[PDB]
Design a protein around this ligand. Structure first.
Ligand code: K
Ligand code: K
Ligand code: MG
Ligand code: MG
Ligand code: MG
Ligand code: MG
Ligand code: MG
Length: 53
RNA sequence: CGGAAAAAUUCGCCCAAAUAUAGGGGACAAUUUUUCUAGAGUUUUAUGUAAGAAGGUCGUACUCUAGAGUGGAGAGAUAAA
């Protein structure tokens, strides 16, 4: 019983009055932590070689 | 003691104890793996510069010697001697 009660609370939904009152944070900033490789990493590297030469 | 974004492992950490069997949660922590470039470095003779060291010099003054030099009784010192 002590385990179910504690596990239920840690995975409970936020309060409604907390949802309809808290300001908005764009998901582009609050969830985009992953940093992928530059898709143009190969094109840029080929242009940087020409400019450096 | 110390970056970024992920992953494996410990199950550290937390529920959480009774020195807790067995599990759950994944932010953080430890070992490790793969990527990243903001820290740290390398190249592109920088400029500027009384850091350092070696081998040689220059000059102003000083000093000694010589010219039986010129001159012929003072000089120097001190607040004064
Ligand atoms: K665990
Ligand atoms: K863990
Ligand atoms: Mg790499
Ligand atoms: Mg690069
Ligand atoms: Mg740098
Ligand atoms: Mg120079
Ligand atoms: Mg004479």
């Amino acid at each position: 019983a002590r385990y179910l009660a504690n596990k239920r609370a840690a995975q409970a939904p936020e309060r409604l009055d907390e949802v309809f009152t808290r300001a908005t944070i764009r998901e582009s900033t609050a969830k985009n932590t992953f940093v992928p490789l530059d898709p143009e990493a190969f094109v840029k590297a080929e242009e940087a070689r020409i400019k450096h030469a």
